[PDB]
Amino acid sequence: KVKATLGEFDLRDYRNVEVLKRFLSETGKILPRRRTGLSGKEQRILAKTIKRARILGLLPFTEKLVRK
Amino acid sequence: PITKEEKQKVIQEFARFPGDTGSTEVQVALLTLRINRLSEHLKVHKKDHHSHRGLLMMVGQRRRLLRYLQREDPERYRALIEKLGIRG
Amino acid sequence: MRRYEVNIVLNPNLDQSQLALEKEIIQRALENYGARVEKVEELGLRRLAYPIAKDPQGYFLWYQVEMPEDRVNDLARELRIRDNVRRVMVVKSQEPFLANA
Amino acid sequence: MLTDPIADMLTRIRNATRVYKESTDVPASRFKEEILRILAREGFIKGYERVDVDGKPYLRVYLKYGPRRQGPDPRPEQVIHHIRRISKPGRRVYVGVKEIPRVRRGLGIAILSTSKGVLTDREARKLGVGGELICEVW
RNA sequence: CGGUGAAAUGCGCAGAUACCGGGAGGAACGCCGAUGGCGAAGGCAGCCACCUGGUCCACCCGUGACGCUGAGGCGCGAAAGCGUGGGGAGCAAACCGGAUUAGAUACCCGGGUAGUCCACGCCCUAAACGAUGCGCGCUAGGUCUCUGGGUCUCCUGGGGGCCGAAGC
C-alpha cells in the first residue's frame, strides 16, 4: 500500500508532486482506495488535491501504456 | 455573511441584562437579521429556490415568536416591533 | 478578510528583464485590490506533466495574500490579461491536513 | 410532542411487561402517581417509589408476573394481560354513575377520575359518583 | 473506409480511411466514485471564488412551553411539451433511403428536422416508489459502513445498510 510505504505528508499541499505521483497509476488515473491505503475522509481529499495539481500541469491527466 | 463582530453587536443592542444570550427579543431581532440578509440576497439569484425555503422557515419562526409576545406581555411586543420595524 | 494562495504560472522562456517585468505588474496589481502579501515562494522552472500552450515547462509563483472577499474574483480577471501569464489559481488558505502520521 | 401522559405511562407499563422487565421508569406527576397508587393496591403490580434520573423525577413502577410455566415457552402468565386508555384526548369520555361499566364480569377493573378523586368502578359506585373514565385493565 | 448474423444504403482518385501539426466550436465532465454523501421532494457529481439554505457534535450558558399537526391559500415541482430569442458538437420522434421478412408501415445499417444546451416566461404530470403522511415516547442484540465528542483496544451522539428477540 502507498500510505504504509511513505511518511508524514500534507494531504492538502497540491504542489508536492514527489508525493502525489505515488497516488497515480501507470496511467494518469487515480488509485482506488484499495491501493492508496487511505480512509474515507483521506481519499476524499486526495481526490480534490490531485484534481488541482493536474490543472497547474504538475500531475498528468492521463498516461500511455508501458511494459514491452 | 454575518460576522461575530456584527452579530454580538446585534445582541448587545437588544438584550435584557448584559450577560444574556437567549430571550425572545434577541431571537427575533436575530432572525430578522438573517432574514434581511436573505432578502437582499434573493433580490438577486431569483433562481435560488432552495434558500428561499430557509427563508420562509425563518419567517415562520419569527412570527411564531411574535405571536407569543402578543400573548405574554404586549408592552414588549409593541415596543419590539418599533425597535425592529415590522408590522408597525 | 480571508487568507489565500495565489498560483501563478507564466512562460518559462522569459529573460531576466522580462520576468521581473511581469512580477512587477502582479505586485502593483495586488495592491490595487488590497492584497497584503504574507509571503511568497518562487519555485521557478518545473517540468509540466502536460504541455501548456505548446511549451513543456513553466515558471512558478505562489502568493499567500490576505485580500478583501468581494474582490477576489476580480483580482484574477486582471491577472489573467498578460499573454505571458498562462495559469492562475486562487485558493482559500486551509489548515494543512496531516496524513500517515 | 408527548400528547398524552397517562397514555404513555400505560404503554411503558404494557411495553415492559411484554418483554419481562423487573421494573420500569416513567415521568412522575401527582396524577400518574394516583393511578399507579391504584394498580399496586389492586395488585396488578408490586409497587412504585419516587426517583431521580440524572436530576429529573421519575416513578419506578415495579412489575409483577406469574410463575414459570412448564413445557415449551415458560413465559409466565402476566398479571396485567390487558390495559388500555378508554378516554383519550380529543374524544374524552365521561360516564354517569349508572353508566359505569362492569369489567370482565368484574375481574378487571376500571379507573375513573371523579370529583371525589381517582377511583375504581367498585369504589365509585360505593361512592355514588362518576367521572372521566381513564382506563380498562385486566 | 464504414457497417452487419451476413450484407447493402453512404463516404473515397475534387485523393477518403489510418497518421502528425494547427485552428473553430458545442456538449459533457473519465479516474477518485462506493453496496458513499447531501437535500422536503423533484433532484445533485471536472476545478475556483463569491453569495446562500439545512444539518450534526461538545459546553449546558440564556429564554421559559413560546409546542404538533396542518382544510383552503402560497411556493417548489423529472422527462417530454408550448412562446420569444440565442445556440447546434453528439445524439435523434417524425421524415429519406438501406437490408431482414410470407409482409415490416419494426427490431439491424446510413442519413436526418423538432428536440435535446442557454435566457426569460408558460406547462405541473409521473412506477413524482421506501408503491410505506408529519411529530413525540416505549420495546434484546449482532454486524458492516459515513460522520461528530470522549479519559479512543472501549464508551457516547447522528445517518445509511444487512441479520435478528418480543411483537405483527
Strands C55-65 and D56-62: unpaired
State residue D37 phi and psi, 5-degree precision. Answer: -50, -40
User: Percentage helix, strand, coil, to 5, in chain B?
Assistant: 70, 0, 30
Closest residue on chain C to A21 (Cα):
C49
Q: How many Å apart are CA D127 and CA D116, to the nearest integer?
A: 9
Residue D8's nearest nucleotide, by CA–C1', is: E137
Query: A3: which 3 cell numbers?
Result: 500510505
Q: Do C49 and A57 touch (CB under 8 A)?
A: yes
Domain ranges, residue C61? 1-101
- CA-CA-CA-CA torsion sign (B11, B15, B19, B22): negative
Q: Do residues C6 and C90 touch, judged by C-beta distance below 8 A?
A: yes
Helix, strand or coil for residue D111? strand
| C-alpha distances in Å from residue A44, one per residue of A2, A40, C12 | 16, 6, 33
Q: How far is A30 from chain C (nearest CA, A)?
A: 15
CA pair distance D6, D17, nearest whole angstrom: 17
For residue C4, the chain A residues in CB contact (below 8 A) are none
Which whole-number Å values give the CA distances from A59 to A31, A55, C59, D93, in the listed order? 13, 8, 16, 77
The reply to whether CATH 3.30.1490.10 applies to domain D81-138 is yes
Q: Which nucleotides of E are covered by protein (CB under 7 A)?
A: 21-22, 30-34, 36, 39-41, 46-54, 61-68, 70, 75-77, 120-121, 135-140, 145-148, 165-167
Amino acid in the structure at residue B45: H
Q: For position B82, which CATH number holds?
A: 1.10.287.10
Distance, CA of D113 to CA of D46 (rounded, Å): 22
DSSP type of residue A21:
G
Experiment used for this model = X-ray
CATH homologous superfamily, domain A1-68: Ribosomal protein S18 (4.10.640.10)
Q: Shortest CA distance to D132 belongs to which of D14, D33, D29, D35?
A: D35
Phi, psi of A29, deg, nearest 5: -45, 150
- What CA dihedral angle connects C48, C51, C52 and C53, to 10 degrees? 150
Domain count, chain B: 1
Instruction: Tell me if A59 and C49 make a contact (CB, 8 A cut-off).
Output: yes
Of A55, D136, A48, D6, the C-alpha closest to C52 is: A55
Distance CA B1, CA C69 (A): 11
What's the distance, Cα to Cα, between the start and end of chain D in Å?
Answer: 29
Q: Where are the domains of chain D?
A: 3-80, 81-138
C60 within 8 A of C87, measured Cβ to Cβ: no
Helix (H, G, I), strand (E, B) or coil at B75: helix
Q: Does C86 touch chain A (CB under 8 A)?
A: no
The residue range of the domain holding B13 is: 1-88
Going by C-alpha positions, the residue among B28, B24, B4 that lies closest to residue B16 is B24
Our count of domains for chain C comes to 1
CATH architecture of D3-80: 2-Layer Sandwich (3.30)
Query: What angle is formed at CA A16 by the lines to CA A58 and CA C23, rounded to 5 degrees?
Result: 65
DSSP per-residue string spanning C53-75: TTEEEEEEEEEEE---GGGHHHH
Q: CA-CA distance, B80 to B77, in Å (whole number)?
A: 5
Q: What CATH number is associated with residue C2?
A: 3.30.70.60
Residue among C50, C60, C97 whose CB faces A11 most closely: C97
Question: What own/partner pairs with CB < 8 Å and gap ≥ 24 does A10-13 have?
Answer: A10/C96, A10/C97, A10/C98, A10/C99, A11/A42, A11/A45, A11/A46, A11/A49, A11/C97, A11/C98, A11/C99, A12/A45, A12/A49, A12/C94, A12/C96, A12/C97, A13/A49, A13/C96
Q: How many residues does chain A have?
A: 68
How far is D87 from D94, CA to CA, in rounded Å?
8
Phi, psi for residue D96 in degrees, rounded to 5: -85, 160
